[PDB]
Scaffold this active site. Sequence first.
Site, mmCIF file in Angstrom:
data_model
loop_
_atom_site.group_PDB
_atom_site.id
_atom_site.type_symbol
_atom_site.label_atom_id
_atom_site.label_comp_id
_atom_site.label_asym_id
_atom_site.label_seq_id
_atom_site.Cartn_x
_atom_site.Cartn_y
_atom_site.Cartn_z
ATOM 1 N N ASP A 37 99.336 9.260 13.774
ATOM 2 C CA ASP A 37 100.093 8.312 14.587
ATOM 3 C C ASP A 37 101.490 8.849 14.885
ATOM 4 O OD1 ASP A 37 101.191 6.136 15.838
ATOM 5 O OD2 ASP A 37 101.296 4.871 14.021
ATOM 6 N N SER B 133 109.276 10.224 31.939
ATOM 7 C CA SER B 133 108.392 10.694 32.985
ATOM 8 C C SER B 133 109.118 10.611 34.321
ATOM 9 C CB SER B 133 107.104 9.858 32.989
ATOM 10 O OG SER B 133 106.306 10.119 34.130
#
Length: 330
Positions: A35, A199
């Site tokens: 994770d 992004s």
Amino acid sequence: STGSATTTPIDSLDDAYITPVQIGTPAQTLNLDFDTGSSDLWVFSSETTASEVDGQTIYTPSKSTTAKLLSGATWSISYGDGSSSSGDVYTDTVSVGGLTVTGQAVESAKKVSSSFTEDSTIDGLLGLAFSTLNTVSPTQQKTFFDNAKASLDSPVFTADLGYHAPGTYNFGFIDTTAYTGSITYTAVSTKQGFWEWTSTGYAVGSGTFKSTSIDGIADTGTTLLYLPATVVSAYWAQVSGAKSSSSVGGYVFPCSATLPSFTFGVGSARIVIPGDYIDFGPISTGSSSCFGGIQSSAGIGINIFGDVALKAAFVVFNGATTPTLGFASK
């Protein structure tokens, strides 16, 4: 040193991935959920409340000659999805794919929430976010990667998740045969303890690319792709009959649909998520309403590039002095 381990979907939907991890002496192999959105290595154990164990493999520290109680240490974690676990702490030898850390903090669960009990395939979590998020008190502990880092050939790990198929976590090297083209690296903020990056935009299907900054986290422990409501609405508007359902808890779409791809930007590079990666199947057994793999982050407080996004790429988690993230197509 290096390590390399195969990671395997837990079910036919890729709801999560499990990777075998050796703990203790002799080795006890548990299948953990790696994770990159958290920083605790915790396991089902001989200390876990009996009624809360249903088929998981447990770590029994009393059977490990290298286990030592970390005296006074406790831990307690609550994940964004509302699940939780807590307990005490041992140090022991932990190996992943041939890479060994001695003295790793292994957090032994005394209590786990119902969703953990109900998932027989996940024996615990191995956190790969920054150690500043680790919950051990009163002495915070380091992640497996943090402990291994100085010994590694290069201070990196990579995630290469498969679509409806196994994939690979590598530690300490970049497998140049595992991706196509070049790796595009992008800046990371560690201020919130996550692999947080920005992004450069998105496209839906064959549509034109929208240049827009989307701050979010690279999180292998989250199944879906969670993005701003504007972006998500633009995606689902291209699927006839798709709608956001408050009762189901997100966007659903007719199972008869053919889904468009979704592209996200990494600098000037582009990662394309095929439409099929966005299908999470019937909302309930036999339903013709299917659950979407792109969902709104509104009310989460952060955008999350979870498995739906990451499995479309070869992803480098670069733990150099100034961390960065790399993405390649594959």
